Design an enzyme around this catalytic site. Structure first.
Site, PDB file in Angstrom:
ATOM      1  N   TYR A   1       0.731  -1.419  -0.270  1.00 21.06           N
ATOM      2  CA  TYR A   1      -0.315   0.462   0.100  1.00 21.06           C
ATOM      3  C   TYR A   1       0.890   1.285  -0.054  1.00 21.06           C
ATOM      4  O   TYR A   1       0.043   2.477  -0.461  1.00 21.06           O
ATOM      5  CB  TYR A   1      -0.859   0.180   1.247  1.00 21.06           C
TER       6      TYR A   1
ATOM      7  N   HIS B   1      -4.470   6.025  -1.184  1.00 19.84           N
ATOM      8  CA  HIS B   1      -4.747   6.377   0.188  1.00 19.84           C
ATOM      9  C   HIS B   1      -4.084   6.037   1.439  1.00 19.84           C
ATOM     10  O   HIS B   1      -3.492   7.003   2.201  1.00 19.84           O
ATOM     11  CB  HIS B   1      -5.653   5.386   0.511  1.00 19.84           C
TER      12      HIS B   1
ATOM     13  N   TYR C   1      -4.762  -0.371  10.216  1.00 18.80           N
ATOM     14  CA  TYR C   1      -5.138  -0.435   9.550  1.00 18.80           C
ATOM     15  C   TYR C   1      -5.727   0.580   9.183  1.00 18.80           C
ATOM     16  O   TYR C   1      -6.026   1.990  10.196  1.00 18.80           O
ATOM     17  CB  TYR C   1      -6.141  -2.127   8.603  1.00 18.80           C
TER      18      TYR C   1
ATOM     19  N   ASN D   1      -8.532   2.145   8.460  1.00 13.27           N
ATOM     20  CA  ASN D   1     -10.190   1.830   9.316  1.00 13.27           C
ATOM     21  C   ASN D   1     -10.006   2.200  10.897  1.00 13.27           C
ATOM     22  O   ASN D   1     -10.559   2.829  11.567  1.00 13.27           O
ATOM     23  CB  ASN D   1     -10.816   1.101   9.223  1.00 13.27           C
TER      24      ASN D   1
ATOM     25  N   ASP E   1      -5.312  11.928   1.690  1.00 13.21           N
ATOM     26  CA  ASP E   1      -5.967  11.962   0.226  1.00 13.21           C
ATOM     27  C   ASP E   1      -7.158  11.846   0.213  1.00 13.21           C
ATOM     28  O   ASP E   1      -8.195  11.584   1.215  1.00 13.21           O
ATOM     29  CB  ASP E   1      -6.219  10.411  -0.629  1.00 13.21           C
TER      30      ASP E   1
ATOM     31  N   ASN F   1     -12.546   6.979   5.008  1.00  5.59           N
ATOM     32  CA  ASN F   1     -12.836   6.535   6.422  1.00  5.59           C
ATOM     33  C   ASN F   1     -11.564   6.311   7.246  1.00  5.59           C
ATOM     34  O   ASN F   1     -12.391   6.104   8.813  1.00  5.59           O
ATOM     35  CB  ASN F   1     -12.059   4.249   5.987  1.00  5.59           C
TER      36      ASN F   1
END
Length: 179
Positions: A17, A22, A68, A70, A95, A116
């Site tokens: 990632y 994100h 993470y 979230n 972002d 999120n």
């Protein structure tokens, strides 16, 4: 001001990632840390990693959650408590789907834009009144779900522009810190 400032970049963990949409917040937070020669270290009172320094004569605390996206809020909250940083003195870089690719805007409070991570932060801080450095990534293509969109790397076309965009975002963060 003697009050500490907490700059938080949002993003998912792992190499998979690192270059995704994100994860722009993470990219800018690293740029900022690089700029003031600070290095991120584990913060066991929050779980995130922190980098400290000074900008515009202000005490600066840079941070990146290690969980993470979230769950970002559950690390940022305890982090703010440790440094006794009021929500208003918290600046989170993220972002933003509601802004054209490359457009950077500042804002205090307001909505999450469907992010999120922001949703998580607002919950942990008990308020939306924290500063934000919004970095436009543009709306998602109709053929893709928004969640899938943000977890993809930028296209080759966009990739060419991402580096300067992050420098601009880091610059906007510094100007924000100064004023």
């Amino acid at each position: 001001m003697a009050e500490p400032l907490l700059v938080v970049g949002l993003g998912n963990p792992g190499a998979n990632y690192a270059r995704t949409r994100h994860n722009l917040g993470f990219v800018v937070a690293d740029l900022l840390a690089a700029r003031l020669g600070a290095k991120f270290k584990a913060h066991k009172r929050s779980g995130a990693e922190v980098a400290t320094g000074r900008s515009a004569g202000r005490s600066l605390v840079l941070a990146k959650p290690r969980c993470y996206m979230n769950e970002s809020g559950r690390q940022i909250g305890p982090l703010a408590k440790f440094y006794s940083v009021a929500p208003a003195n918290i600046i989170v870089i993220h972002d933003d789907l509601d802004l054209e690719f490359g457009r950077i805007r500042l804002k205090i409070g307001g909505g999450e834009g469907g992010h999120n991570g922001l949703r998580s932060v607002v919950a942990a801080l008990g308020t939306k009144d924290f500063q934000r450095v919004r970095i436009g990534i543009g709306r998602p293509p109709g053929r893709k779900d928004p969640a899938a969109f943000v977890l993809e790397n930028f296209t080759p076309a966009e990739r060419a522009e991402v580096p300067t965009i992050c420098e601009q975002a880091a610059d906007a963060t510094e100007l924000l810190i100064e004023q």
